[PDB]
């Protein structure tokens, strides 16, 4: 280790993803205890990162720790909560630091449990929605800032299809995952002009196999799932290659449209426009 | 095609109404012959609102004064101001918390604010005004900004709460569509306007062509009163030429074809 030295990431680090990008990288997984959370953790271990996870069950939590430390995991650890208490959200972050000495990449999946209906005067979901979806991330992301700011780390900000076009019978849970992209979005132009060398990754998905996603769309909506593996693996890949946004779905259609390059187009020609040297 | 006519006797709601676009929607709707409840916190300009109101023609003007950080103040406005008209035809959502540009670095404060005011409260007062909108085929008018449609730096929390605003609302919009609900939902996406708050905002950290705030307040009422989805409102021709996005219509019409609506 002191007799070693040199970089992963040299020509073609853009655009060509190897394992050994995540070899002894320190990195957080929230909601990791199940779906694409536990997924991630799992290729994350097998690249040779040291990991912390988190959700809620101390026990779910304990398995998956147990399952990474047999994959290869460099470390890891876990650290149980609720993110609706935005003081676990702010303390969490500090021992996970602490835990693996710094870190690289920090992974903000979890969300409040949402279930498909029509939007009547469920304020209280609204509100829960907004706090454990978007809030949280905020809080997580302003307590981990020091440490990625020293390592040139990376950000990376579970999505959905449902947080980029409108669906019916998800209005609060859509809110918050469009308010995630204003929010890391705006960030993403301020480190650019700030020299904040913090990359941020928004993951588009569509529907995946989870066996949350697959007990709340029965009966209601018929839609094609793609596995939760692979979309765990393309999230990683975004992150590790720094990319601001990654798309993952069943639909070739879905990835063929998806895209917003006049959104792109405008804030490049708002870019100039604004002081903000001040 | 709109006409003043369209507005004459028509009961309506306007937030943030005793200064800026709001005052301005005020204004335009007073002319056109409406019955008018506008709100913001300072009861002294709200009087001066509603005195100008009557003047330029309003069949009845009042305000009622409060802070949208209170969703029970947000929720008995709305049963207030519809005993007041004797019912609801348009609610138009207009009022922010101060916001000023800076950078973000710490002030979560100042984003649960923007997400309360600028959102929470939105939803608050759509849910009181459901009832009255749904008896008169009535309207939902939706102050947004470029910066809830791309992304702006200085502006993180703001523009958060403007992007929930068109994830909600776009959202119930479909619900409505499929549940034969006949309330329109409008959302207004303006480039910099000329207000007092936003030129004072921008000075020195941004020089454009400010767009006027009597023709952006008019051509947020047109497109309530015209039903129209989004309105869409700059100074720049190469904004409205790249702010439309089609293919996301595209998408959203492709998936409405999963869904069993008939539960
Ligand atoms: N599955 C899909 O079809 C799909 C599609 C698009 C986007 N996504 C996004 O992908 C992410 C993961 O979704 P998933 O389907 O993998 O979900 P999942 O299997 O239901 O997992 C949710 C995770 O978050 C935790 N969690 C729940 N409530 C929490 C709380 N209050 N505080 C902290 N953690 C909490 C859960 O464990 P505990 O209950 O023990 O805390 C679990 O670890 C979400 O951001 C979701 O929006 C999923
Ligand atoms: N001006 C622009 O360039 C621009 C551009 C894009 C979008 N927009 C949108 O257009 C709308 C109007 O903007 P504007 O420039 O006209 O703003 P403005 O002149 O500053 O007016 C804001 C209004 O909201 C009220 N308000 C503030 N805090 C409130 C609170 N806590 N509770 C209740 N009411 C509150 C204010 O009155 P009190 O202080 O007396 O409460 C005032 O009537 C906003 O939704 C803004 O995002 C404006
Ligand atoms: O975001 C998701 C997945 C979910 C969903 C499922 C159908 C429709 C909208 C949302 C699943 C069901 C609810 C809401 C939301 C998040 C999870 C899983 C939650 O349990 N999609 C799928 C679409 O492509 C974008
Ligand atoms: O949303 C607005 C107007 C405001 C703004 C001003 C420059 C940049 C971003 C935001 C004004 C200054 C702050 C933030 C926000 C709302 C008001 C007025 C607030 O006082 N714009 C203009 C741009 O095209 C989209």
């Not at 978007?134 to 040139?152: D, E, G, I, R, W």
């Not at 692979?230 to 990654?246: S, Y």
């Not at 069943?250 to 449209?257: E, H």
Request: glycine share 8%.
């Amino acid at each position: 280790a002191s007799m070693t030295g040199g970089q992963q990431m040299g020509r073609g680090s853009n655009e060509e993803f190897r394992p050994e990008m995540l070899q002894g990288k320190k990195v957080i997984v929230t909601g990791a205890s199940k779906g694409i959370g536990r997924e991630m953790a799992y290729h994350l271990a097998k690249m040779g990162a040291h990991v912390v996870v988190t959700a809620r069950s101390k026990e779910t939590l304990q398995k998956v720790v147990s399952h990474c430390l047999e994959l290869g995991a460099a470390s890891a650890h876990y650290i149980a909560g609720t993110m609706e208490d935005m003081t676990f959200a702010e303390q969490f972050v500090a021992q996970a630091g602490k835990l693996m000495g710094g870190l690289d990449m920090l992974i903000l999946n979890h969300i409040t449990n949402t279930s498909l209906n029509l939007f009547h005067d469920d304020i209280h979901h609204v509100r829960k929605s907004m706090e454990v979806n978007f809030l949280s991330y905020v809080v997580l992301t302003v307590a981990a800032l020091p440490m990625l700011k020293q390592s040139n780390g990376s950000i990376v900000v579970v999505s959905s299809l449902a947080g980029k076009v409108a669906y019916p019978m998800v209005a609060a849970y859509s809110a918050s995952k469009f308010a995630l992209d204003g929010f890391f979005s705006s960030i993403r132009k301020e480190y650019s002009v700030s020299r904040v060398n913090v990359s941020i990754t928004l993951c588009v998905l569509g529907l995946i196999d989870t066996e949350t996603a697959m007990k709340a769309v029965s009966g209601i909506v018929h839609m094609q799932a793609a596995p939760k593996e692979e979309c765990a693996l393309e999230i990683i890949k975004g992150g590790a290659l720094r990319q601001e946004e990654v798309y993952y779905d069943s639909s070739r259609w879905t990835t063929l449209l998806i895209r917003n390059p006049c959104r792109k187009i405008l804030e490049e020609l708002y870019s100039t426009s604004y002081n903000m040297d001040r």
